[PDB]
Design a protein around this ligand. Structure first.
Ligand SMILES: *[C@@H]1O[C@H](CO)[C@@H](O)[C@H](O)[C@H]1NC(C)=O
Ligand SMILES: *[C@@H]1O[C@H](CO)[C@@H](O)[C@H](O)[C@H]1NC(C)=O
Ligand SMILES: [Zn+2]
Length: 203
């Protein structure tokens, strides 16, 4: 929750609407659909890039800790999972002597990694929610929650809650749902999704 709340503010502030309203961006600057596509793809290379990697890493760690993977089949299973979840193949073969996942900082320093997954969703579930109280009409990526007191009050109703109540109840106070949902992310990236589908006709 902490990082999602921190991140939605930056997501809204980076919009060209707030930039042209703050004076940094000249008012005589109309955003072309090409620039919107470029910005969406730059965002996706981070947001949608990290999701399969995070999910695969956490699944491998859970399967190791649960004993489903034998100690002599770790790297085999790891590079098997990476070839069908992340879609990434190792350039050179690795035996059980390697510990490639341990080369990551969060693995060798004993940090839970699933946090970076849910945080990627929650923010969008927040953002898509906060644009409803802000009465946004256009695409989600152009939404700005500024100047709208209703969205701020809806957010604060959960912010003041803290840990006193279950996180599901906190979600229902903003997104109106008890379980995490991925539909806001797809709604956010739909303009990029259509363009990507159109660009891959022959590939
Ligand atoms: C919010 O209100 C201020 C005050 O009039 C205005 O300057 C600004 O353009 C409005 N919109 C945004 C996105 O800041
Ligand atoms: C932007 O819209 C124009 C008008 O339909 C179109 O010709 C152009 O291909 C579009 N570009 C992108 C990146 O969507
Ligand atoms: Zn932070």
């Amino acid at each position: 929750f902490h990082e999602a709340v921190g991140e939605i503010m930056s997501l809204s502030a980076a919009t060209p609407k707030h930039l042209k309203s703050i004076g940094l961006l000249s008012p005589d600057f109309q955003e072309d659909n090409e620039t919107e596509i470029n910005f969406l793809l730059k965002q996706a290379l981070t947001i949608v890039g990290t999701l399969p990697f995070t999910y695969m890493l956490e699944k491998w760690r859970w399967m190791v800790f649960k004993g489903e993977i034998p100690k002599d089949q770790w790297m085999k299973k790891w590079w098997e999972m990476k070839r069908e979840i992340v879609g990434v193949v190792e350039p050179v073969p690795h035996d059980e002597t390697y510990c490639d996942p341990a080369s990551l900082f969060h693995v060798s320093n004993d940090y839970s990694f699933i946090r970076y997954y849910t945080r990627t969703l929650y923010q969008f579930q927040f953002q898509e929610a906060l644009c409803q109280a802000a009465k946004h009409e256009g695409p989600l990526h152009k939404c700005d929650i500024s100047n709208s007191t209703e969205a701020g009050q809806k957010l604060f109703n959960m912010l003041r809650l803290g840990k006193s109540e279950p996180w599901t109840l906190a979600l229902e106070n903003v997104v109106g749902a008890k379980n995490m949902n991925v539909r806001p992310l797809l709604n956010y990236f739909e303009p990029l999704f259509t363009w990507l589908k159109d660009q891959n006709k022959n590939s």
